Amino acid sequence: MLPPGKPEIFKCRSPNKETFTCWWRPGTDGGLPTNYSLTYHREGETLMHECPDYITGGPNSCHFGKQYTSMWRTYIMMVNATNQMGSSFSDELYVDVTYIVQPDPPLELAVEVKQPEDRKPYLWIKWSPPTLIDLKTGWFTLLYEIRLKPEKAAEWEIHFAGQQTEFKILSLHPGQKYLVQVRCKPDAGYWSAWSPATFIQIPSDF
Amino acid sequence: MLRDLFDRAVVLSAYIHNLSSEMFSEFDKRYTHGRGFITKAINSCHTSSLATPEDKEQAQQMNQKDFLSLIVSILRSWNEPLYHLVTEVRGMQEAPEAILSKAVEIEEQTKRLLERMELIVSQVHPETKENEIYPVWSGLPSLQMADEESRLSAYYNLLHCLRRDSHKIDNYLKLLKCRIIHNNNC
Ligand SMILES: [Cl-]
Ligand code: NA
Ligand code: NA
Ligand code: NA
Ligand code: NA
Ligand code: NA
């Protein structure tokens, strides 16, 4: 018997500056919505458009594929929640895809102990970029950070690796097991989540 | 030495965009955070009339000489507004220090980046046409208006446009570096 509460578009994210997704939540408190419609227009245009993909991004989301995503051009978007009793509209949200970029984590993190003759031994760390990103053309640029720590240590040691996909670490404690993770961020935007840990035992004879 | 020139140009363009992004964020938190200034900043950049690529596919399609030309035109077009930004702000009795410091650094570093860009063009495209065609900024009256709201909105739009164009310049330079030096295998 009640119209929906006021919905709110609470998050938008682009993993690769080529697509993006936005998510909304219902209002508490009002009736159950039976439909939502996300509409938007772009700076410089009067045309109103509907969300082109309500499926890809899962529940209460709008996914903008490559055909609908462009940088340096503000999206002005709104979501309405309707049921047979009435309707409610979110506040407008202004989105520049440029400033919502947060890559997925790096991949294939691998760690190896190297012990060369008469030179310092070292932990050799290697990884790959997230799959969705185009570094090769220069469209996207990634920076990386590694962290590692033994269990029960209070602090992670953090190493900024710049744009490399490998890294050498020298001062490690012989016999100790370390957890290592990597994360990445664009030149402009948000750090990814840390990758899952890879584990490494540093040999006693180190 | 093209690799060294490109490397230094990209250090500058990424540093400039960083400063512009932080300037815009600091102005926004401090003056405009509470009132409809972001709605007011829709469609109103002096560089909008340039044909600029809007995605990597248009970028890839751009003739290399014209793409470099375009970066140069955007940088040349910002000389005038950056000068007035700094002049106006520095001329205040109580100049917001962090904002002023960023504006003066961007003003200075943009000149250097334009010099690096002109050297690039000289090396890669020595018979470029030396005629200028860049878009004119003429928004000084709105920066100088007594109406505090119209004035803040003029500053908002200038800073939003700066952050956008500094980003585009950086992203276009990174595209060109990778295309020129690495055949798009960076
Ligand atoms: Cl972050
Ligand atoms: Na997406
Ligand atoms: Na949906
Ligand atoms: Na696109
Ligand atoms: Na922008
Ligand atoms: Na693994």
Side-chain angles (χ1 to χ4, degrees), chain A residues 1-117 120-206, chain B:
Chain A
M1 201 255 161
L2 233 35
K6 176 154 189 222
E8 206 209 331
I9 303 169
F10 65 93
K11 185 174 179 198
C12 290
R13 162 193 190 247
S14 171
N16 65 355
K17 289 193 302 192
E18 304 199 39
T19 66
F20 70 114
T21 304
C22 288
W23 291 271
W24 62 85
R25 53 188 166 217
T28 224
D29 315 336
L32 210 270
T34 58
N35 188 56
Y36 282 106
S37 174
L38 182 141
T39 52
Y40 62 102
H41 51 95
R42 318 236 252 307
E43 111 181 48
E45 303 193 327
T46 50
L47 274 178
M48 173 172 285
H49 297 278
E50 180 158 32
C51 176
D53 180 352
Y54 285 109
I55 306 311
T56 301
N60 290 343
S61 74
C62 181
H63 172 69
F64 296 83
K66 275 187 216 214
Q67 299 186 118
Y68 299 94
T69 295
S70 51
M71 308 282 282
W72 310 307
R73 193 173 168 223
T74 308
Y75 290 74
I76 304 89
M77 68 186 53
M78 192 164 60
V79 65
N80 74 50
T82 57
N83 57 32
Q84 177 79 48
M85 305 304 307
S87 73
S88 192
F89 286 82
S90 68
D91 287 339
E92 259 168 345
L93 172 68
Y94 295 78
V95 181
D96 289 321
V97 169
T98 353
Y99 301 99
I100 59 164
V101 176
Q102 182 196 25
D104 294 325
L107 289 179
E108 297 171 350
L109 182 61
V111 160
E112 245 201 319
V113 34
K114 295 229 100 72
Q115 291 176 107
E117 308 70 13
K120 267 85 36 254
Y122 63 95
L123 189 72
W124 184 219
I125 303 175
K126 292 218 281 83
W127 58 88
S128 292
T131 185
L132 281 176
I133 277 180
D134 182 352
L135 301 168
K136 285 181 196 292
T137 56
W139 179 246
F140 208 99
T141 298
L142 247 5
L143 306 180
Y144 294 104
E145 209 169 47
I146 288 151
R147 66 176 188 181
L148 75 167
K149 183 170 91 50
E151 287 202 323
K152 307 200 184 170
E155 284 172 4
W156 289 92
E157 311 180 80
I158 294 159
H159 298 259
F160 179 69
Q163 306 189 9
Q164 309 188 329
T165 53
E166 59 173 28
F167 200 85
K168 290 175 170 171
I169 287 175
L170 294 289
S171 287
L172 295 192
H173 289 131
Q176 187 55 285
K177 169 182 270 235
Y178 283 84
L179 277 66
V180 180
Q181 289 176 296
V182 58
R183 65 178 185 171
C184 65
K185 66 179 282 298
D187 43 19
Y190 298 83
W191 283 109
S192 70
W194 290 103
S195 64
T198 61
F199 299 84
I200 183 66
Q201 276 280 349
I202 305 311
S204 293
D205 42 83
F206 183 86
Chain B
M1 196 327 195
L2 250 200
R3 297 146 90 139
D4 282 343
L5 262 185
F6 264 102
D7 276 353
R8 176 44 159 197
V10 161
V11 171
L12 289 174
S13 62
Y15 182 78
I16 292 162
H17 167 71
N18 184 63
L19 288 176
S20 298
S21 185
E22 300 177 351
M23 190 164 68
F24 173 75
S25 295
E26 297 179 25
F27 177 84
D28 193 26
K29 74 99 197 147
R30 192 202 144 119
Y31 291 105
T32 45
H33 196 225
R35 272 269 314 100
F37 304 92
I38 184 53
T39 113
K40 290 148 140 275
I42 297 312
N43 198 21
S44 44
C45 292
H46 74 277
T47 55
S48 285
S49 47
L50 283 168
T52 55
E54 215 125 59
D55 60 26
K56 65 173 197 198
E57 292 83 5
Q58 286 178 2
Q60 306 187 243
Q61 301 264 15
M62 273 227 59
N63 167 284
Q64 180 178 298
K65 177 208 266 278
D66 292 354
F67 207 177
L68 287 165
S69 185
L70 168 71
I71 289 170
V72 169
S73 291
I74 293 160
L75 285 165
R76 279 173 180 162
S77 86
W78 268 97
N79 292 336
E80 177 79 6
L82 285 168
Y83 168 80
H84 291 290
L85 176 55
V86 165
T87 302
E88 294 298 307
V89 169
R90 209 178 168 247
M92 287 166 184
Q93 23 203 41
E94 286 130 78
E97 166 268 316
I99 291 167
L100 178 60
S101 170
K102 293 176 177 77
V104 152
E105 258 206 274
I106 288 162
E107 185 188 25
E108 279 169 16
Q109 298 299 355
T110 291
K111 321 179 180 155
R112 314 254 254 273
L113 172 55
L114 176 58
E115 287 175 52
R116 228 81 340 137
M117 292 312 302
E118 284 174 336
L119 280 162
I120 295 174
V121 176
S122 288
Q123 292 304 140
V124 190
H125 297 103
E127 18 281 344
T128 61
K129 28 188 66 286
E130 115 277 27
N131 87 288
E132 293 181 290
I133 80 294
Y134 62 86
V136 172
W137 175 91
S138 50
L140 185 62
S142 81
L143 298 185
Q144 290 183 330
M145 67 202 347
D147 188 55
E148 189 201 62
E149 182 147 280
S150 295
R151 184 170 37 115
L152 290 176
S153 160
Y155 279 91
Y156 191 90
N157 185 71
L158 188 171
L159 301 184
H160 172 84
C161 295
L162 178 58
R163 176 181 77 165
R164 168 172 293 171
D165 282 358
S166 55
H167 189 265
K168 270 179 198 203
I169 280 157
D170 178 60
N171 210 142
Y172 296 165
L173 272 176
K174 284 164 174 174
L175 283 157
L176 280 157
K177 175 157 93 31
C178 288
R179 177 157 148 178
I180 291 166
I181 293 166
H182 304 281
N183 183 38
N184 286 330
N185 294 291
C186 281

